[PDB]
Amino acid sequence: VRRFHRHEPRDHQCSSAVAKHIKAPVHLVWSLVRRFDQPQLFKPFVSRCEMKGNIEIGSVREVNVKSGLPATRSTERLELLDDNEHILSVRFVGGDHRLKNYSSILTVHPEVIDGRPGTLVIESFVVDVPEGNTKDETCYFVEALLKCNLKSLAEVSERLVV
Amino acid sequence: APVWGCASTRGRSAEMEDASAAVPRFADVPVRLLASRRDLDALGLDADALRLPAHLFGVFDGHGGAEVANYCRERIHVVLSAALARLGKDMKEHWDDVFTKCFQRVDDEVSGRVTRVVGGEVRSEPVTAENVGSTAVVALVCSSHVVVANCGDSRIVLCRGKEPVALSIDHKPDRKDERARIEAQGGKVIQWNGYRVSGILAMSRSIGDRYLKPFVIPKPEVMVVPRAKDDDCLILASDGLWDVVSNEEACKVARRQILLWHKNNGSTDPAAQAAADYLMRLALKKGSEDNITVIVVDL
Ligand SMILES: O=S(=O)(NCc1ccccn1)c1ccc(Br)c2ccccc12
Ligand SMILES: [Mg+2]
Ligand SMILES: [Mg+2]
């Protein structure tokens, strides 16, 4: 399940992936992820998010993040949303986050966890390494934020199954 | 008995996540932490029974939200007082131990690892989300000593008599002993608009932020300073002030605002409140975009 998460980063780009197993059915987890206009639903770093019009390919949301972070704003563009295959692709097109040409692929797959309905979520990305940082630093920084967001998605999904 | 002022504001910031505390006579300190057994034994006053009242001042710069800073204002002095009262039943080591166990207990309460009292019932869930945290710089002020415990990038500065002298060092990730501790645990300190743990948090020590665990710890840094007939004032402030005002700049202004109130004129104290108000507005006029919180304690 990395036909969707295989990347060819250039020499001055870095790529990685993070995964998370969620004790909730895929339909519930995907219904959270699909809501492109409300990332605050499971991302604790988001304090507001605006996007004009309906959710469609090419839609752009303007994300404001809370205090205690290196960035404050981020402009992100919906590249792919497959509601049948549960694939969400986003591209960063602005913001003070220093993550340029950031492209990411999120997929959610069915799994049995402890005999009950579960979910595997995988988010991979490619991004330019900004000058003055290493590939190991850029990956570690992005993975840490993605890991916190997937853990919060797991908590949100599992406390809506109760 | 204590003489202080306190000023705080959003500033240009969207939301207010700073908090402060000023608790007079919050506890009684066992004097064996403030005087040699043999210097009090010379007066026949064995310090194992003596205690002296003390006042608690604290500033708590929250991030990710204000719920953790507000919790520190409500809870840290209560936990400190219960900790002092039982210790009475090397003194530098003892000060570090009572402050370390107090900060750890509050951190464990914030993160939901231990239960907390609310009424007579108990709550065990975390106080708020995983990304919410707060600095904590507290000043224990009694007649003989000022005891400072610092956790984060807030700062307390003493004016004695014209020097600023820093009673706390900012817990920035690039700071050498902090970077070494973080990397020894397999972590990383990354420059990403400033040096940050995992490239995210601009501090290596705080209350809360359970998602940056075990790299961001609640261990406070303690400094015991005896009061010498020379001190002017204490200045506790979030980095909203220290980002645009230096230790020299803040000390000379606070010490002068106190003097100009008493030559012009005869809860908070008006002269010290004027110093805190002036320092807050001064930071506003020098281009500070953060929350501002200033406590001035007239010694
Ligand atoms: O909205 S997020 O919660 N998405 C998670 C995320 C973060 C970073 C990269 C990819 N994906 C977010 C949090 C913190 C920072 Br710093 C961000 C900076 C730019 C864009 C989004 C940012
Ligand atoms: Mg703050
Ligand atoms: Mg601040």
Nearest CA to ligand 1 atom 14: A45
Domain boundaries, chain A: 1-162
Q: How many domains does chain B have?
A: 1
Taking 3-state DSSP, the helix, strand and coil percentages for chain B, each rounded to the nearest 5, stand at 35, 30, 35
**B189 to chain A: nearest residue by CA?**
A137
CATH C-level class of A1-162: alpha beta
For residue B199, give the nearest of A66, A67, A70 by CB distance. Answer: A70
CA distance A116 to B69: 39
Q: For residue B135, give the nearest of B236, B56, B234 by alpha carbon.
A: B236
Place of tokens 């009673």: B167
**Domain span including residue B294:** 1-299
**A57 contacts chain B (CB < 8 A):** no
Backbone angles phi, psi at B76, to 5 degrees: -65, -45
b/e map A116-152, b = 16+ CB within 10 Å: ebbbbbbbbbbbbbeeebebebbbbbbbbbbbbbbbb
Whether A61 has a binding-site annotation, put simply, is no
Contact A67, B64 (CB under 8 A): yes
Contact A68 B194 (CB under 8 A): no
Alpha carbon of B64: minimum distance to chain A alpha carbons (Å) = 5
- B185 exposure class (CB count in 10 Å sphere: 0-12, 13-18, 19+): exposed
**Residues A21, A24: Cα–Cα separation, whole Å:** 9
Decide: B231 and B167 in contact? Cβ < 8 Å: no
> How far is the C-alpha of B134 from the C-alpha of B62, rounded, in Å?
4
Enumerate the residues of chain B whose CB falls inside 8 A of the CB of residue A97: none
Best probe of the B interface among A69, A96, A155, A162, by most B CBs < 10 A, is A69
Interface mutation vs chain A, best among B18, B179, B189, B192, most A CBs within 10 Å: B192
Which ligand has the shortest distance to the CA of A68?
A: 2
CB atoms within 10 A of CB B85: 14
Rounded Cα distance between B272 and B266, Å, is 13
DSSP string, B130-174: TT-EE-EEEEEE-SSEEEEEEESS-EEEEEESS-EEES-----TT
CB B93 within 8 A of CB B153: no
Question: Taking CA atoms, what residue in B is nearest to A156?
Answer: B129
**CATH number for the domain including B6?**
3.60.40.10
- From residue B246, how far is each of B122, B157, B173, B217, B243 by CA, in Å? 44, 10, 20, 27, 8
Nearest alpha-carbon partner for B299 in B139, B81, B77:
B139
Helix ranges, chain B (H): 37-41, 67-88, 91-110, 176-184, 239-242, 247-264, 270-285
Task: Specify the length of chain B in residues.
Answer: 299
Q: Residue B153 CA: which ligand is closest?
A: 3
Q: Which residues pair with B165 in a beta bridge?
A: B158
Q: How many CB atoms lie within 10 A of CB B3?
A: 17
**Residues B207/B238, Cβ–Cβ less than 8 Å:** no
Q: CA A26 → CA A21, A55, A119, B20, B146, distances in Å? A: 11, 21, 5, 45, 58
